[PDB]
């Protein structure tokens, strides 16, 4: 498990045991954004809902937003992901299977939106703590798009009464 921004947001891969989840908790993790697909989760936990209850049972609030390996969230999923990540700033953990491609993409996107980083700085930032972050061209293209639509994303994320 790694932090991109000390105790505010970090990433990791799929936990194998419950002890590994308790390790997250000791690290400061409080909320978990789950990105792998049901079948990926099931490889280590048998059932997706059982995995989510385990996170909830260990005091972590989970949010499942399934993204296909090598892929990126749909625009609607990204809105949900960002509303979730921005609702509470402390102890956010984002994980996929290996915590490199998918996780790295979401993490870089977070930096872009919250710090106004240019796509390349955001990628280098994540790669410095997680080598290989942002695996595919689709993920890289997505990040440039996020920077380009930054103002629009923030506006939509905070549309309120």
- How far apart CA 147 and CA 103 sit, in angstroms, is 17
Domains in the chain: how many in total? 1
Instruction: State this model's resolution in angstroms.
Output: 1.9
- How far apart CA 82 and CA 140 sit, in angstroms, is 18
Tokens of 129: 């703590």
* Helix spans in 16-95 (H): 18-27, 38-45, 48-57, 75-87
Residue 160: strand, helix, or coil: coil
Owning domain of residue 29: 1-161
Could you tell me if 102 and 143 are in contact, meaning their C-beta atoms sit under 8 angstroms apart?
Answer: no
In 122-157, which positions are buried (b, 16+ CB within 10 angstroms) versus exposed (e)? bbebbeeebeebbbeeebbebbebbbebbeebeeeb
Residue 110 CB coordination number (10 Å): 25
Experimental determination technique:
X-ray
DSSP 8-state code for residue 98 = S
Which residues does 49 contact at the CB level (< 8 Å), separation at least 6? none
**Which residues are designated catalytic?**
96
CATH number of the domain at 36, please. 3.90.190.10
Helix, strand, coil percent content, the chain, rounded in steps of 5? 55, 10, 35
Residue 64: strand, helix, or coil: strand
């Amino acid at each position: 498990m790694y932090w991109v921004r000390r105790k505010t947001i970090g990433g990791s891969g799929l936990p194998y045991t419950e002890n590994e989840i308790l390790e997250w908790r000791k690290e400061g993790v409080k909320r978990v954004l789950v990105l792998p697909e049901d079948w990926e989760i099931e490889e280590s936990w048998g059932d997706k809902d059982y995995y989510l209850s385990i996170l909830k049972k260990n005091g972590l609030q989970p949010l499942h937003i399934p993204i296909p390996d090598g892929g990126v969230p749909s625009d609607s999923q990204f809105l949900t992901i960002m509303k979730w990540l921005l609702s509470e700033k402390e102890g956010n953990l984002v994980h996929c299977v290996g915590g490199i491609g998918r996780t790295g993409t979401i993490l870089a996107s977070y930096l872009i939106l919250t710090e106004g980083l240019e796509v390349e700085s955001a990628i280098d930032e994540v790669r410095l703590v997680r080598p290989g972050a942002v695996q595919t061209y689709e993920q890289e293209m997505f990040l440039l798009r996020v920077e380009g639509m930054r103002k629009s994303w923030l506006k939509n994320i905070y549309s309120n009464s």
